[PDB]
Design a protein around this nucleic acid. Structure first.
Ligand code: NA
Length: 254
DNA sequence: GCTGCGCAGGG
DNA sequence: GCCCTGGCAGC
């Protein structure tokens, strides 16, 4: 069995101060995917950049302290692809696509759309490019695993306050519609393969002590193509892990 | 973003 | 009446 963990750290240096490595060796993921590291590798202390036992790959945004994704993996991929072939998406440090023989692993930090009409438009177009990219790789005979911060809660059950948020990027019908669309192309929300209950969240606002009162959303997901779901054994939320406004999620396969 | 609040329809 | 849906300063 291969354990993969995904975590929108919201600043890899910041989380390093708040027990990152201690936990890292504590959870022992086969693969560790990180989103929103807000760093370039040149900014990271040796023992944070290079964790013993793992190969590490970093893809920072062009812009400083912004976005960025990272992957640590005991067994290296035979290729890491850091983009979809669309410059405006490929320069924000949002994409890592690792080829691990059995599957392709997409580590994606999808755009947040709250800031502006442009940032939602960017978000929705990024969603479109990903779907095409993953569909092309899946239509060609590959199994795919997609993890990361989609920045959208799919259904009213996937957030504490569904009604007040229907007008705000993150729960817009256009955004929820796209997740339906994703699933109808033959992709499975692995968490809801085993768990249909409320109160399962993955992010909470820092403002209003939102986390201790479990007022949050499930914005982080593990998707696999429908041909691959029979290889998934568990999908769970690591709710007790602190450090970010997000908590880790996990997957184990075969 | 969450939590209040005033306000306005229903019902 | 009351409830319980549906712009905003305060954080
Ligand atoms: Na590995």
């Amino acid at each position: 069995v291969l354990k993969i963990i995904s975590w929108n750290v919201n600043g890899l240096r910041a989380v390093h101060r708040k027990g990152f490595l201690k936990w890292f060796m504590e959870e022992k993921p086969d693969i560790l995917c990180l989103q929103e590291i807000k760093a370039a590798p040149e900014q990271l202390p040796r023992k944070l950049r290079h964790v013993e036992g793992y190969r590490s790959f970093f893809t920072p945004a062009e812009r400083k302290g912004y976005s960025g994704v990272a992957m640590y993996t005991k067994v290296p991929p035979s290729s890491l692809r850091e983009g979809f072939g669309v410059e405006r998406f490929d320069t924000e440090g949002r994409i890592q696509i690792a080829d691990f023989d059995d599957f392709l692993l997409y580590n994606i930090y999808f755009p947040n759309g709250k800031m502006s009409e442009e940032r939602l438009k960017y978000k929705l177009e990024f969603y479109d490019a990903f779907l095409e990219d993953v569909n092309r790789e899946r239509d060609s005979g590959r199994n795919v695993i997609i993890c990361g911060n989609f920045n959208t809660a799919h259904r009213e059950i996937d957030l504490a306050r569904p009604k007040e948020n229907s007008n705000v990027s993150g729960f817009l019908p256009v955004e929820r519609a796209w997740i339906d669309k994703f699933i109808e192309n033959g992709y499975v929300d692995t968490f809801r393969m085993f768990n249909s209950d409320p109160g399962q969240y993955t992010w909470w606002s820092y403002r209003t002590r939102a986390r201790e009162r479990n007022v949050g959303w499930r914005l982080d997901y593990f998707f696999v193509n429908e041909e691959f779901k029979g290889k998934v054994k568990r999908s769970w939320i690591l709710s007790d892990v602190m450090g970010s406004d997000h908590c880790p999620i996990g997957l184990e396969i075969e």
